[PDB]
Design a protein around this nucleic acid. Structure first.
Length: 1315
RNA sequence: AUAACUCAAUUUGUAAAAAAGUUUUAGAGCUAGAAAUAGCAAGUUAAAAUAAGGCUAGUCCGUUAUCAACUUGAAAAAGUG
DNA sequence: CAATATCGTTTTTTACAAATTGAGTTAT
DNA sequence: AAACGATATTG
């Protein structure tokens, strides 16, 4: 009877139904409602359109913040309860006056002045401590009893903005010694390098190093004062290290191995060892003197103050900003009074402008302020331009860059103060430790929410049932159980033994397994032997003992040279399981050898269980203390020093397989586990896959007896949730396409699926740094410039030709080429991973393969550097060099040309497996599946070529029909292919010398559609002789369907979700639009929110009052039920509406009208709801095919003959231009009703009738955005911007007819809103 | 087409933290003038909220997914041409 | 009532598991 | 990152 074609997209599912002649049936569907019609004819073609599914990411970030906010509230709430009793004596109303600081005087309960509750004290406080940092410093330094209130403020400010937790352990501020500490580096160097000492030279390390520039410059500046020493010289890189940077010590010391050290990465103790153990331990006291100068200079850029003057150098640093800002602003006033007085009001009164007023009172950033007076200053000062570059000019203390500041330095003052004032307040002494905890304490990430079983999100497990707090957390939260659950709730079960947890990737047993499985198919021959042979049991264990347990990685060259030669005495050997080196390696054995320094223990086979628990622990837990905790049992087996280093050794990653599978389950026969068979299987050297599939053994069936919704099922898949929206809708479409054919399943279903600025500047910034290249500090760029492919590429290649070797010219990009590495005529990859910039695609070598071996030779060296500079990926590097493995074999070639029309994407196959198992559900007599329906899958190239080649052209911007057209051409091409070539079923249909013919064949698979290349009019399958294509009638019946104007389009109506409103918190204003940020906060006094999201409009017919007397008038209107209001409304719709003003509401006439709800009006004009307030265009323009194809060609400047018979088609049919405008205008005037817009278009067209046919078509294609279904949008007719006519009312709809559609549009229910 | 491993890149989902930003109030503006309006001085800080809120009352939850109509359902979802 | 213009919270860091794509080894 | 629905402003 029939087949179904689908096109699955993120915003659309197009569908078609086709009969055996490739025709698409029409049919009469019932039409429900209260209308004149009881039926309608509908062609079974259409498309569902829908807004994108969104990721949970924004939802998550909002969520994680919501919680940061409720918890910083409880921090202050902890602090305040401690203070309550002694503060209820100094000042009854203090913690209240704070609470209501936000209220206008009128709504206040206590005195307006928060701190002291009168004007004279409050005024005085502000005079003495302009900023809270003034108060922080005094409270830390001073010894005087201080006011409980001024103490409680300093403390809360520290707790309420406690800075970051990115450093572990304790930070101690101690500069002062920087000059002596630098001269200890220069001394404890010149000891070692006796020959060529560095002149300490009274060089000002102090200033150069604690200057306010970058690290990478403070370095240049410091080797600038050192004569005849390079910034890459040994002392050069030490200084980079002392400064916090990541330098590379390799070329100094002649190493083959990279030696980079970041003092404040957690592997520094292990990397320095790896170096020192290579260069000698007589260099320990050089990475020592560079650590000493590091601890005095770590926090330069935050501190800016000699810590000899104050235990409070962070606040002092801030008071410094204050004084400077004051000093500099006094001076900047004076200077403007003298020199540019006309412009003074502007700078200092005007908040509109980014003057000092716009800085302070407006909304102007430091950046925008600094951008405004750069000019003014130099047109006038010398010192202020110094400060503006440094970004140090009229600084505020609360700023975007305080993200540096660790919780440790604020804990610093927080501590100082308590110590100071516990001398006077007994309760600050008794509670000093509670209060540092509030600053200090932080729920560990591996615990998560502190839920009591109303958190979907939560997993932590309670050691008790009390309330958790920063002080009782250890004793009430079972942190270990939680830490474990954090990881184990996310890890895979062994798919094979689903009861069993996958082992740690780095499990000693796991690695043994991984090596054996790979060592059991290593073959080898000598000269003497008749055939290549597997390894013997005995051999493996000797290979494993001598090679795997002394080298991290074992080479084939080690195998030949180190085992065979020196244990077998073969001068020759030919190995056949591995290449170059062994994929598997006992990574963990050597980790543990280097640490437990006892070979005999790791081998000893009774230690197995323990060492498998040590690694599990090293993997489950990344908290070093908890690791210590877990490892405690075994303290007795290895020295103090050896536990200190086991705990630091952490692992991540999980296996794919369990312990039971590998070395647990036995063969009944053998009493041998898998690992036993890998370790020795005699003459057969069976491998895991095999072992699990050979019926000679117990294993396959020990496994088989261990095995096991739709919406749930689709959401559990792996891909964008955007495409998973398509997937559901495509299925739901298919079930209505089945219902519509009277519950008859198709013979066939055909599915095809479809496929910035910041991340690029970091890829280059980082790239060029590591490369030691001047190109940035020589042609600065910005984030948004690198969206130019050619510019991006130029910079990713160090301004250098990828195929030649020679600078390129930033000013000649437009003359050079973006060549594809593996050519575009194999791989339709057009990403950075397959593109290169070069002065011509020529220099590549052959058009017909990877870049030549000549080129690979010359360039390889550079490609490596770019690879090492993360300026090319491994994928790109590997393609680039592939010519030096014979490049593209005539079978790799064939490989890709099949890949071009065969879907390999996992997600598409998931789609097919679902549709198959849903269509095919009945079993035969021998009890295998009866496959009633074939699920064909197609790449999107087939139907695009098919469209190019027979001139069924597509132009997306005309209307939404092409989604449906593609799905029809998918059912057509799809069913034809597997009619003509039933053997391609193995490749396209879901379920269970030669290379050049595979190519030529797949290359040409689609020929049977054509009459010449000479093929017969009628095409047939040679075996069954069934008809597959009648070139004399079938191309005609395609052209019919394409030209068919009534195609079923349908926007998915959708209840809106997300933010209540816009986020912006607006000044006060009289306006019923404004929304209360909290119940008591009338926005007429406090400001608040505008722009709520309508979750859905709702038709109210009721009565409202009118005029002084409260005469009931009668109304029918659309009321927008906002997202906030939604839960209220649904709980009691009448009550909600009554309180809005409505009366005698007719509850049975209440229509939910989601976004997009459809309305047909007067001349088949349609509108779709956007809001209770604004309508969208609801009509499609059915442009004739002749005009579509005209517009394709015209706009598009085969070969010369056809690219001429189709250019002479354009010139001959130029009447089509005026005809196409005539079309848009009969439509626009019937349905769009944008008089002035239509008339600027008519005008716009007429002026440009004098311009090439190509140009005039490119821009008629833009005119369709006047006529496009959905929200109006701006477009240009040439240089004529035509702003959007919008429908800013929903009244006209209120007596129109509501159309309620099925997903397919086929079934309807039209209601005639005249009631 | 599947399975283990290797190397790289990506995607999805979760938790813990940070800095700003905004909004009201507080930080006595001053000297003229009846008045509207001038001149000058000031400005860097702070409290609080940061989805309204919710009952389950947790140092929890609140912006993802899912949604034609009619009948049936809490619901998912079924029945309906 | 209709044309036109303005508007939209931003950014950091740490820890982790899972698919998937695609170059390679070994296998059903 | 737009796009498009909410606002104010404006004619």
């Amino acid at each position: 009877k029939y087949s179904i074609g689908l096109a699955i997209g993120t915003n659309s599912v197009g569908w078609a139904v086709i009969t055996d002649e490739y025709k698409v049936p029409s049919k009469k569907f019932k039409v429900l409602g209260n209308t004149d019609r009881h039926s309608i004819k509908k062609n079974l073609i259409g498309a569902l359109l829908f807004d994108s599914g969104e990721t949970a990411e924004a939802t998550r970030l909002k969520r994680t913040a919501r919680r940061r906010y409720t918890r910083r509230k409880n921090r202050i709430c902890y602090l305040q309860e401690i203070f309550s009793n002694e503060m209820a004596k100094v000042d009854d109303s203090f913690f209240h006056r704070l609470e209501e600081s936000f209220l206008v005087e009128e709504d206040k309960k206590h005195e307006r002045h928060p701190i002291f509750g009168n004007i004279v004290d409050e005024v005085a406080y502000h005079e003495k401590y302009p900023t809270i940092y003034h108060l922080r410093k005094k409270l830390v330094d001073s010894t005087d009893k201080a006011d409980l209130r001024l103490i409680y403020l300093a403390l809360a400010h520290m707790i309420k903005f406690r800075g970051h937790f990115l450093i572990e352990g304790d930070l101690n501020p101690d500069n002062s010694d920087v000059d002596k500490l630098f001269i200890q580096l220069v001394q404890t160097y010149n000891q070692l390098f006796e020959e060529n000492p560095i002149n300490a030279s009274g060089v000002d390390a102090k200033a150069i190093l604690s200057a306010r520039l970058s690290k990478s410059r403070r370095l240049e500046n410091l080797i600038a004062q050192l004569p005849g020493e390079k910034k890459n010289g040994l002392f050069g890189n030490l200084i980079a290290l002392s400064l916090g940077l990541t330098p590379n010590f390799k070329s100094n010391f002649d190493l083959a191995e990279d030696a980079k050290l970041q003092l404040s990465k957690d592997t520094y103790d292990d990397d320095l060892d790896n170096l020192l153990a290579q260069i000698g331990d007589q260099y320990a006291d050089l990475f020592l003197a560079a650590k000493n100068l590091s601890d005095a200079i770590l926090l330069s850029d935050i501190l800016r103050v000699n810590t000899e003057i104050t235990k409070a150098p962070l606040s002092a640093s801030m008071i410094k900003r204050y004084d400077e800002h004051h000093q500099d602003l006094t001076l900047l006033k004076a200077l403007v009074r003298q020199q540019l007085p006309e412009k003074y009001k502007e700078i200092f009164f005007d908040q509109s402008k980014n003057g000092y007023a716009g800085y302070i009172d407006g909304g102007a950033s430091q950046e925008e302020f600094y951008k405004f007076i750069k000019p003014i200053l130099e047109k006038m000062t010398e010192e202020l331009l110094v400060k503006l570059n440094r970004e140090d000019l009229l600084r505020k203390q609360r700023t975007f860059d305080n993200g540096s500041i660790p919780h440790q330095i604020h804990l610093g003052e927080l501590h100082a103060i308590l110590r100071r004032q516990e001398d006077f307040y007994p309760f600050l002494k008794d509670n000093r430790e509670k209060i540092e905890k509030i600053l200090t304490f932080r729920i560990p990430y591996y615990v998560g929410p502190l839920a009591r079983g109303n958190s979907r999100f939560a997993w932590m497990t309670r050691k008790s049932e009390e309330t958790i707090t920063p002080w009782n957390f250890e004793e009430v939260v079972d942190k270990g159980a939680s830490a474990q659950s954090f990881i184990e709730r996310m890890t895979n079960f062994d798919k094979n033994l689903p009861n069993e947890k996958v082992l740690p990737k780095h499990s000693l047993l796991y690695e043994y397994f991984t090596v054996y499985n790979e060592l059991t198919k290593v073959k080898y021959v000598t000269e003497g032997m008749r055939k290549p042979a597997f390894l013997s049991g005995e051999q493996k264990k000797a290979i494993v003992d001598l090679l795997f347990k002394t080298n991290r990685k074992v080479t084939v060259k080690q195998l030949k040279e180190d085992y065979f030669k020196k244990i077998e005495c073969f001068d020759s050997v030919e190995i056949s399981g591995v290449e170059d080196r062994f994929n598997a390696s006992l990574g963990t054995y050597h980790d543990l050898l280097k640490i437990i320094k006892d070979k005999d223990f790791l081998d000893n086979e009774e230690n197995e269980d323990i060492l498998e628990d040590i690694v599990l622990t090293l993997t489950l837990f990344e908290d070093r203390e908890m690791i210590e905790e877990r490892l405690k049992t075994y303290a007795h087996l290895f020295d103090d020093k050896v536990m200190k280093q086991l705990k630091r050794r952490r692992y991540t990653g999980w296996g794919r397989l369990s312990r039971k599978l590998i070395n647990g389950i036995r063969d009944k026969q053998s009493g041998k586990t898998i690992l036993d068979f890998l370790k020795s299987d005699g003459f057969a050297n069976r491998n895991f896959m095999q072992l699990i599939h050979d019926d000679s053994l117990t294993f396959k069936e020990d496994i088989q007896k261990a095995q096991v919704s739709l919406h749930e099922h689709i959401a559990n898949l792996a891909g964008s949730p955007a495409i998973k929206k398509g997937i559901l809708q495509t299925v739901k479409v298919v079930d209505e396409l089945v219902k519509v054919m009277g519950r008859h399943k198709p013979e066939n279903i055909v599915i095809e699926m479809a496929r910035n600025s910041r991340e690029r500047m970091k890829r280059i910034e980082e790239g060029i740094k590591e490369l030691g290249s001047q190109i940035l500090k020589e042609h600065p760029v910005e984030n948004t410039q690198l969206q130019n492919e050619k510019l991006y590429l130029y910079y990713l290649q160090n301004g250098r030709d990828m195929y030649v070797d020679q600078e390129l010219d930033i000013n000649r990009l437009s003359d050079y080429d973006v060549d594809a590495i593996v050519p575009q005529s194999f791989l339709k990859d057009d990403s950075i991973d397959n593109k290169v910039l070069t002065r011509s695609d020529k220099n590549r070598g052959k058009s017909d393969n990877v870049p030549s071996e000549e080129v690979v030779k010359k360039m390889k060296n550079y490609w490596r550097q770019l690879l090492n500079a993360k300026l090319i990926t491994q994928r790109k590097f590997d393609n680039l060099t592939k010519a030096e493995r014979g490049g593209l074999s005539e079978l790799d070639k064939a490989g890709f040309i099949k890949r071009q029309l065969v879907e390999t994407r996992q997600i598409t196959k998931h789609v097919a497996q679902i549709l198959d198992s849903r269509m095919n559900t009945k079993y035969d007599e021998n009890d295998k599946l009866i496959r009633e329906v074939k699920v064909i899958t197609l790449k999107s190239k087939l139907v695009s070529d098919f469209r190019k080649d027979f001139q069924f052209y597509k132009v997306r911007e005309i209307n939404n029909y092409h989604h449906a057209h593609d799905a029809y051409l998918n059912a057509v091409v799809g069913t034809a292919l597997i009619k003509k070539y039933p053997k391609l079923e193995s490749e396209f249909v879901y379920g269970d010398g030669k290379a050049t013919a595979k190519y030529f064949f797949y290359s040409n698979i689609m020929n049977f559609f054509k009459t010449e290349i000479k093929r017969p009019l009628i095409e047939t399958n040679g075996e069954t002789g069934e008809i597959v294509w009648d070139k004399g009638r079938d191309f005609a019946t395609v052209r019919k369907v394409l030209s068919m104007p009534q195609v079923n389009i349908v926007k998915k109506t959708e209840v809106q979700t997300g933010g209540f409103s816009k986020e912006s918190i607006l000044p006060k204003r009289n306006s019923d639009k404004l929304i209360a940020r909290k119940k008591d906060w009338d926005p007429k006094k406090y400001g608040g929110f505008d722009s709520p999201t309508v979750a859905y409009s709702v038709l109210v017919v009721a009565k409202v009052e009118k005029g002084k007397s409260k005469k009931l008038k009668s109304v029918k209107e659309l009321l927008g039920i906002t997202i906030m209001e939604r839960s209220s409304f649904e709980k009691n719709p009448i009550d909600f509406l009554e309180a809005k003003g409505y009366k005698e509401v007719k509850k049975d006439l209440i229509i939910k009208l989601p976004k997009y709800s459809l309305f047909e009006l007067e001349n088949g004009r349609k509108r779709m709801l956007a809001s209770a307030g604004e309508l969208q265009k609801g009509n499609e323009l059915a442009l004739p095919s002749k005009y579509v194809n005209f517009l394709y060609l015209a706009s598009h400047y085969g070969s010369p003959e056809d690219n001429e018979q189709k250019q002479l088609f354009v010139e001959q049919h130029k009447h089509y231009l005026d005809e196409i405008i005539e079309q848009i205008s009969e439509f626009s005037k019937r349905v769009i009703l944008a008089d002035a817009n239509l008339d600027k278009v008519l005008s716009a067209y007429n002026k440009h009738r004098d311009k090439p046919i190509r140009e005039q078509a490119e821009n008629i294609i833009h005119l369709f955005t006047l006529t496009n279904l959905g929200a109006p949008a701006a477009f240009k007719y040439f240089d004529t911007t035509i702003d959007r006519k919008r429908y800013t009312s929903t009244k006209e709809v209120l007596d129109a007819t509501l159309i309620h559609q099925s997903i397919t549009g086929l079934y309807e229910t039209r209601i005639d809103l005249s009631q």
